[PDB]
Amino acid sequence: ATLKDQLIYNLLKEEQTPQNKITVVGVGAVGMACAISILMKDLADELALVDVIEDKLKGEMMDLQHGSLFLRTPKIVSGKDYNVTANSKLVIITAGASRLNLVQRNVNIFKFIIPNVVKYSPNCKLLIVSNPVDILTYVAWKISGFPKNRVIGSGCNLDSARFRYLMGERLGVHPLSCHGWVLGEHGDSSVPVWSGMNVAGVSLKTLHPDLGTDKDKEQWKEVHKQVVESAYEVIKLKGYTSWAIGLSVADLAESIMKNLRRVHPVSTMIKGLYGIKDDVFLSVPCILGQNGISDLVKVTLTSEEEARLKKSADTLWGIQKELQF
Amino acid sequence: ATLKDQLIYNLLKEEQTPQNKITVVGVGAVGMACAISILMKDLADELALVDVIEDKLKGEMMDLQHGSLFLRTPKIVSGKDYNVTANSKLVIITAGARQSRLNLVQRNVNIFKFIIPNVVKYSPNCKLLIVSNPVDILTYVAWKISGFPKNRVIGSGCNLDSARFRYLMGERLGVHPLSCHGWVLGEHGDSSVPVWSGMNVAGVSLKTLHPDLGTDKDKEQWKEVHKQVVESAYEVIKLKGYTSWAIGLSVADLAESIMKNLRRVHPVSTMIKGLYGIKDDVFLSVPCILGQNGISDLVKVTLTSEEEARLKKSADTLWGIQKELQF
Amino acid sequence: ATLKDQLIYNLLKEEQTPQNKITVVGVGAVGMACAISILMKDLADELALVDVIEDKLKGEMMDLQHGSLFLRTPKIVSGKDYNVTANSKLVIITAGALNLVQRNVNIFKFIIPNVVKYSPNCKLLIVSNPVDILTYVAWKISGFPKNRVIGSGCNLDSARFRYLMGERLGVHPLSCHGWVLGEHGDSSVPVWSGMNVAGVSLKTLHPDLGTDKDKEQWKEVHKQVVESAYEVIKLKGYTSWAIGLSVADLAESIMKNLRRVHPVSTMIKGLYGIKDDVFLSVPCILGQNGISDLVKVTLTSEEEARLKKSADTLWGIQKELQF
Amino acid sequence: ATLKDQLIYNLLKEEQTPQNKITVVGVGAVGMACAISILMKDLADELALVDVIEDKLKGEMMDLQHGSLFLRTPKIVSGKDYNVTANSKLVIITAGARLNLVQRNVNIFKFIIPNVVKYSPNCKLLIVSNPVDILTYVAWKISGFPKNRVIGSGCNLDSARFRYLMGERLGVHPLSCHGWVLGEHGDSSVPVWSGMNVAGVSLKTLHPDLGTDKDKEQWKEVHKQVVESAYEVIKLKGYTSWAIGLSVADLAESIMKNLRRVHPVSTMIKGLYGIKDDVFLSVPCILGQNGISDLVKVTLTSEEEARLKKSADTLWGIQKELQF
Numbered sequence A: 001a002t003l004k005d006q007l008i009y010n011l012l013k014e015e016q017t018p019q020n021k022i023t024v025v026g027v028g029a030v031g032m033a034c035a036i037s038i039l040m041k042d043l044a045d046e047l048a049l050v051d052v053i054e055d056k057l058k059g060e061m062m063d064l065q066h067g068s069l070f071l072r073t074p075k076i077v078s079g080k081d082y083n084v085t086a087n088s089k090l091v092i093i094t095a096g097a098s099r100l101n102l103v104q105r106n107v108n109i110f111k112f113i114i115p116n117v118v119k120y121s122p123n124c125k126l127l128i129v130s131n132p133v134d135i136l137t138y139v140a141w142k143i144s145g146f147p148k149n150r151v152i153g154s155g156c157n158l159d160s161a162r163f164r165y166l167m168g169e170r171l172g173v174h175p176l177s178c179h180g181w182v183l184g185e186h187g188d189s190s191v192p193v194w195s196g197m198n199v200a201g202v203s204l205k206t207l208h209p210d211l212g213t214d215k216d217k218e219q220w221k222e223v224h225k226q227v228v229e230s231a232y233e234v235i236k237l238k239g240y241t242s243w244a245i246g247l248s249v250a251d252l253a254e255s256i257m258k259n260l261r262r263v264h265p266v267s268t269m270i271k272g273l274y275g276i277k278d279d280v281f282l283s284v285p286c287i288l289g290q291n292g293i294s295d296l297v298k299v300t301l302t303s304e305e306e307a308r309l310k311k312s313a314d315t316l317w318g319i320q321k322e323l324q325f
Numbered sequence B: 001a002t003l004k005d006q007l008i009y010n011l012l013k014e015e016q017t018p019q020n021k022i023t024v025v026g027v028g029a030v031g032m033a034c035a036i037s038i039l040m041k042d043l044a045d046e047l048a049l050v051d052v053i054e055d056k057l058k059g060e061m062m063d064l065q066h067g068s069l070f071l072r073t074p075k076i077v078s079g080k081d082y083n084v085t086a087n088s089k090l091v092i093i094t095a096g097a098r099q100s101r102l103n104l105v106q107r108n109v110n111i112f113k114f115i116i117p118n119v120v121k122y123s124p125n126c127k128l129l130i131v132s133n134p135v136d137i138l139t140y141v142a143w144k145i146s147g148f149p150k151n152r153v154i155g156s157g158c159n160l161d162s163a164r165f166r167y168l169m170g171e172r173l174g175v176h177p178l179s180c181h182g183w184v185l186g187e188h189g190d191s192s193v194p195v196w197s198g199m200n201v202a203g204v205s206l207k208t209l210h211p212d213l214g215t216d217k218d219k220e221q222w223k224e225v226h227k228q229v230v231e232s233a234y235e236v237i238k239l240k241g242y243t244s245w246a247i248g249l250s251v252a253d254l255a256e257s258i259m260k261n262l263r264r265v266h267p268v269s270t271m272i273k274g275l276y277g278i279k280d281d282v283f284l285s286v287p288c289i290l291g292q293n294g295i296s297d298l299v300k301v302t303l304t305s306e307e308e309a310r311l312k313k314s315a316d317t318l319w320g321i322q323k324e325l326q327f
Numbered sequence C: 001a002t003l004k005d006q007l008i009y010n011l012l013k014e015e016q017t018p019q020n021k022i023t024v025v026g027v028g029a030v031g032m033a034c035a036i037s038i039l040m041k042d043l044a045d046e047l048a049l050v051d052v053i054e055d056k057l058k059g060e061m062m063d064l065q066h067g068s069l070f071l072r073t074p075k076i077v078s079g080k081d082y083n084v085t086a087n088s089k090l091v092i093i094t095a096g097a098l099n100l101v102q103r104n105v106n107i108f109k110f111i112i113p114n115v116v117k118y119s120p121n122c123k124l125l126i127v128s129n130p131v132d133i134l135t136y137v138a139w140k141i142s143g144f145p146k147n148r149v150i151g152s153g154c155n156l157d158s159a160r161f162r163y164l165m166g167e168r169l170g171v172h173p174l175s176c177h178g179w180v181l182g183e184h185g186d187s188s189v190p191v192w193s194g195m196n197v198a199g200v201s202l203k204t205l206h207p208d209l210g211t212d213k214d215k216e217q218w219k220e221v222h223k224q225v226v227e228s229a230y231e232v233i234k235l236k237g238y239t240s241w242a243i244g245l246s247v248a249d250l251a252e253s254i255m256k257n258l259r260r261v262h263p264v265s266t267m268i269k270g271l272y273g274i275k276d277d278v279f280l281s282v283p284c285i286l287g288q289n290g291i292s293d294l295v296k297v298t299l300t301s302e303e304e305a306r307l308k309k310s311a312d313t314l315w316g317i318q319k320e321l322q323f
Numbered sequence D: 001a002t003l004k005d006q007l008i009y010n011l012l013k014e015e016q017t018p019q020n021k022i023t024v025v026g027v028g029a030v031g032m033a034c035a036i037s038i039l040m041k042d043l044a045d046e047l048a049l050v051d052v053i054e055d056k057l058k059g060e061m062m063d064l065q066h067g068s069l070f071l072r073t074p075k076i077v078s079g080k081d082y083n084v085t086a087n088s089k090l091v092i093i094t095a096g097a098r099l100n101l102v103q104r105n106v107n108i109f110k111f112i113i114p115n116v117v118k119y120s121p122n123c124k125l126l127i128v129s130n131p132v133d134i135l136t137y138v139a140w141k142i143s144g145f146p147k148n149r150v151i152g153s154g155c156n157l158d159s160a161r162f163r164y165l166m167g168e169r170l171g172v173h174p175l176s177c178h179g180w181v182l183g184e185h186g187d188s189s190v191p192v193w194s195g196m197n198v199a200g201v202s203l204k205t206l207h208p209d210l211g212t213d214k215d216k217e218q219w220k221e222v223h224k225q226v227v228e229s230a231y232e233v234i235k236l237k238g239y240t241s242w243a244i245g246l247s248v249a250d251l252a253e254s255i256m257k258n259l260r261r262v263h264p265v266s267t268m269i270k271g272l273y274g275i276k277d278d279v280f281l282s283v284p285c286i287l288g289q290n291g292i293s294d295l296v297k298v299t300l301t302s303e304e305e306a307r308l309k310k311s312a313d314t315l316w317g318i319q320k321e322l323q324f
């Protein structure tokens, strides 16, 4: 009799499949920020990390494990082999590297990652964070063979969060109570939907018809410009962004894992909307839950706003048709 | 009229002061992990960040602000000037480049000579939580420089050591670390002392069940659990370069007890003069009751002759270094 | 020496004045639901309970205290005497019985000066019905500036509305936005123009929204907000859980200085052609100083007229009250 | 096309089943305290309520539903028919009256338990209804479940009360005051003095008279207060609810999140302490997604073993006469 056998009488050895498992692929700054935020929100009963850099992977794993006393996630695993990811409800991909090469190089990474993920978690939802996110969501969708509902791109979720932060600073109101949607292509070409911006259901555009135009005395257009300038500025200042993307991703994870059916601006296949007929992924408000994107909101856009999304779809398809699978 | 004034009618513009403000000094890997953990536990109404590297400081500030939608800490500020830290309840020092030990002391004392008086100037009534290494020496140093009473100068101490210990114990037993109790005390790091007599699950003493526990005669080598606390630490540095997540979680747990006045007991570093035959002004980890006045009480653990000798030895070495420090 | 002194060496005995204290007055179904909700949200470092029924009060305190292991609120106290409430940041009034209003006024004549004596700088949050009138009564008796006297108002009404909207749309209520303003309860006003998902206006899509001639009868969503409350009283005898949760949401914003916007009852003279000292719900920014700002909702003529009629009705009652 | 269709484009209508459903049976003071505590802890994606009083059930359901904006449990259902409870991970039984006390809750359980097993054959059963140790045996007998999936709330609350009182005496948070009350829930529970400690410092070693009549500080009265304060609370407010609700939600947390934390709950103790009868008593158990996977073999003094054994004989004496 060992000490363990002297202290503890076992009733059954029958270990079960983990029921609420999340995997993060890529343990760089983004991936780890996603990991810590997911752990502090108690979303998973098992977390798996994967990367190609083996020492860094083990170290990050152990560092999380050593905080186990302060968490409610009883099993943290990692490995280069995707067997550690088996039976994940949700797999978050943050792995990634002129700049048309860059796309094909991340496609090449995805050619390896995606089939391994699918092999071990055929029923998972895929959440793509890697950039350029809209293209890479299409790539994951294409390589995986999943229905469109199970391939979600982070998209404009962070863009909108920044927008609401900035709006909140201008109005002196918590971002939670400042509503506004940045849609379309993540990053420099995103579209701020001025018609939807509100506090307490009071449309800013109705109060201030010049809102978001060049005639706007207060230049609210700057808020959206600042959304892009902020991201360049953070990179210039600290070298990367981590905390904000980690938090926005944990929020998406919460909706999926808990089947909340909250509405988030994420990247989904928008074929058949806004005059678009190519297989491209762009952000619109989506209902997120246990089967992923079940529904999307049909935002009423101005002709200018539809045109901007159309141009994005055309540019995105232009790149995609040239990619090698 | 501006859009804001059309939308919003102001009842008053009295600018008041934060009620539950926390400052983190040094926004490296440790400091920023501390920050995210504190933010995700809703412990503060204002978070202030200080560092000497101005671009890194701003970028970190901005990156947290951008996650505001997902948090309930409405104000995050930063700056090189300590005026951003005014009226903090709790100030956490994680400053100084990560790591000989005497040369580490030397450079972190010099940093503290600048940091601590600026913290005291703006937050005279704060609790100071020292994380920077060597943590026991630097807790003494903060207490000497600040002039604060003993209760308000807390060193992270063996809080992480004990958490690592409990993780490892839980792994061998198949029990959650929360339900595996055991205390690593004394000097943080290489010379810490595992108190075998206190190790238990459900009040069942492991040492009583297994008298060889922690001795060289133990066939299950439970002494390796404490050795693995030490080895774990070196291994994480080898693998990723630094520790961040575990220390950040451990610090947020201490902040929780202090901000919410919980009077929970934690292994942290406090002025141990008067215990264990120790007559010098040294800080070492014992179990301390933490609350809104910091360390209000400490637990008097019965130690074996050997365990007591190790604390005494640490106290002798630490006082040997400290007596030569120039203030 | 005692076991305590053998185990524990004390560094200092000194006790601070409470830093994040909440008081709930009235330990009925509403008061206790507010209490449990506040406790499970870790909003207070000290909770005080006050009621006139001493056995009930003691029993409720002990039951909560016996749950201390599972909570992070280390001091829970109670008493008939308001000395237990000293230095509260937030005092929540849920105690209660033209007859009924005056009976609650009489209760408030005892309660409010006692609250003020022991927490002169607190925010008051009034839950007791009829809430809009009794928030006015607390304001008058206390002598507090209007920013520190807040009525639970239409926070619950709006939460119900968002629950019903969410059910109809297949969307979580958090993403279903819509505001019920004005007088709490029967005479509340659903603001159809603000009802939206993701910034998409339902009224703009569906102009019949909120009219009697609406084929989908979306007006019934607001009627069911009123019908819901009567049904719950019919079926179980009182409402508690929803109101408790709604009050804790308000407390969170105040105690954490969030500056979120909530539909709560505030002194509305100077808006919407209202010229009397009446409290009605509009969207208000809530924080450490209570209500610092309000949102000026653009109302239709019919919406405005409903608020004005409530104002006249409330004031018609209030002018008759003896203090 | 409705407004819903005008607003929302549906990608798929593939309907789903909950992944983390919990059922509470009985919506009285205890049941609803369990429910609100479970809801505020985000343990379930679906909560089902069952009771025989139809208006009360509907009204309590509605009341919780109305606070949905402030919760993260997207569906609350209720019903008289146990089809509303299908595929529950965890079913908490709090129904029954607050020799006669036992046989009447037994009769309730003859209806309830088969109905639960029918719709959720793989669930963990958590029994709260009193007398909890007896009704846990009854649930186990009727269900045919393996013993790991039938758990009584047992002495989780007694130990929580003990730790509260200990904490008040020492000036330490109950979380940091360790002490186990085992055996029978209620009058005959056993305080394990040898395990009582702060920071692993044994109070019995520091204070040898701890738990004896010779004790000048009368620590034995702390355990007496645990036994009593329940009667005290019933006398003052009519029932207990909040503490039990909090304790049940703590157990539910460990089950639903597979935490493998140790709690004192009622389990089959035949084979321990010389006990031979099919009796349930509280010992410390490791709780996770398979219910009680393991138990801690506390080392008891001869007096302590004698006390548990006496309880086992008493309970069996009642149980042998019950008719199923």
Ligand SMILES: NC(=O)c1ccc[n+]([C@@H]2O[C@H](COP(=O)([O-])OP(=O)(O)OC[C@H]3O[C@@H](n4cnc5c(N)ncnc54)[C@H](O)[C@@H]3O)[C@@H](O)[C@H]2O)c1
Residues within 6 Å of the ligand: A025, A026, A027, A028, A029, A030, A031, A050, A051, A052, A053, A094, A095, A096, A097, A109, A112, A113, A129, A130, A131, A132, A133, A154, A155, A158, A186, A240, A241, A245
């Ligand atoms: N959508 C958004 O809003 C959002 C915001 C920030 C970052 N991103 C993206 O996240 C990605 C990563 O960001 P980062 O800062 O952590 O970069 P990083 O370089 O620090 O980390 C990337 C990690 O991916 C790993 N990796 C590379 N190939 C891999 C493979 N085949 N399998 C497993 N792991 C592999 C790398 O080793 C590295 O650890 C980038 O594409 C970045 O653009 C997008």
Ligand SMILES: NC(=O)c1ccc[n+]([C@@H]2O[C@H](COP(=O)([O-])OP(=O)(O)OC[C@H]3O[C@@H](n4cnc5c(N)ncnc54)[C@H](O)[C@@H]3O)[C@@H](O)[C@H]2O)c1
Residues within 6 Å of the ligand: B025, B026, B027, B028, B029, B030, B031, B050, B051, B052, B053, B094, B095, B096, B097, B098, B099, B111, B114, B115, B131, B132, B133, B134, B135, B156, B157, B160, B161, B188, B242, B243, B247
């Ligand atoms: N006690 C424990 O259990 C525990 C565990 C891990 C780390 N630590 C310690 O925490 C400290 C920090 O670790 P790290 O990895 O974050 O180091 P780091 O180098 O990543 O960061 C240090 C930060 O301190 C800043 N800094 C330097 N001088 C400063 C000054 N005068 N004022 C303000 N800020 C200043 C640096 O610019 C830098 O941003 C180290 O001493 C490390 O050993 C202790």
Ligand SMILES: NC(=O)c1ccc[n+]([C@@H]2O[C@H](COP(=O)([O-])OP(=O)(O)OC[C@H]3O[C@@H](n4cnc5c(N)ncnc54)[C@H](O)[C@@H]3O)[C@@H](O)[C@H]2O)c1
Residues within 6 Å of the ligand: C025, C026, C027, C028, C029, C030, C031, C050, C051, C052, C053, C094, C095, C096, C097, C107, C110, C111, C126, C127, C128, C129, C130, C131, C152, C153, C156, C184, C238, C239, C243
């Ligand atoms: N504003 C809202 O949305 C909301 C919703 C529900 C209830 N309410 C109101 O909450 C109030 C109470 O609801 P309830 O169901 O808990 O009623 P209750 O009758 O169950 O409990 C009321 C408590 O008030 C206490 N009380 C009476 N006089 C007192 C005094 N002078 N000092 C201290 N306490 C005193 C009683 O003793 C009792 O415990 C009612 O006015 C009710 O209408 C409003």
Ligand SMILES: NC(=O)c1ccc[n+]([C@@H]2O[C@H](COP(=O)([O-])OP(=O)(O)OC[C@H]3O[C@@H](n4cnc5c(N)ncnc54)[C@H](O)[C@@H]3O)[C@@H](O)[C@H]2O)c1
Residues within 6 Å of the ligand: D025, D026, D027, D028, D029, D030, D031, D050, D051, D052, D053, D094, D095, D096, D097, D098, D108, D111, D112, D127, D128, D129, D130, D131, D132, D153, D154, D157, D185, D239, D240, D241, D244
């Ligand atoms: N284990 C503990 O530590 C602990 C603490 C408190 C109470 N309890 C017990 O919990 C039980 C309930 O306490 P309470 O205060 O909630 O009682 P209660 O009277 O308020 O509620 C009991 C509910 O059970 C319902 N019920 C009765 N028969 C039913 C059936 N066949 N099917 C479904 N529901 C049925 C009743 O309608 C009622 O709603 C009692 O046995 C009490 O002793 C145990």
Ligand SMILES: O=C1O[C@@](c2ccccc2)(c2ccccc2O)CC(O)=C1Sc1ccccc1Cl
Residues within 6 Å of the ligand: A131, A158, A159, A162, A186, A187, A188, A227, A228, A229, A230, A231, A232, A234, A235, A239, A240, A241
């Ligand atoms: O903030 C971000 O950081 C990155 C970026 C990309 C392109 C331009 C600026 C920043 C980045 C660059 C290099 C290394 C790490 C990074 O995370 C990646 C990225 O998508 C964002 S978010 C963003 C970016 C541009 C505009 C608006 C928004 Cl909301």
Ligand SMILES: O=C1O[C@@](c2ccccc2)(c2ccccc2O)CC(O)=C1Sc1ccccc1Cl
Residues within 6 Å of the ligand: B098, B099, B133, B160, B161, B162, B164, B188, B189, B190, B229, B230, B231, B232, B233, B234, B236, B237, B241, B242, B243
């Ligand atoms: O884990 C830690 O990391 C550091 C360390 C110090 C000395 C020996 C090993 C590690 C470290 C070194 C370099 C860079 C960054 C670091 O955080 C600092 C530190 O105190 C710890 S904790 C620890 C250390 C040694 C033994 C047992 C424990 Cl629990």
Ligand SMILES: O=C1O[C@@](c2ccccc2)(c2ccccc2O)CC(O)=C1Sc1ccccc1Cl
Residues within 6 Å of the ligand: C129, C156, C157, C160, C184, C185, C186, C225, C226, C227, C228, C229, C230, C232, C233, C237, C238, C239, C240
């Ligand atoms: O839901 C409520 O319950 C009470 C009520 C008051 C007046 C009419 C119906 C119900 C009630 C009655 C009796 C006993 C206890 C109670 O809480 C009190 C009350 O304000 C509400 S909220 C409400 C009430 C009416 C319409 C719409 C709404 Cl949103």
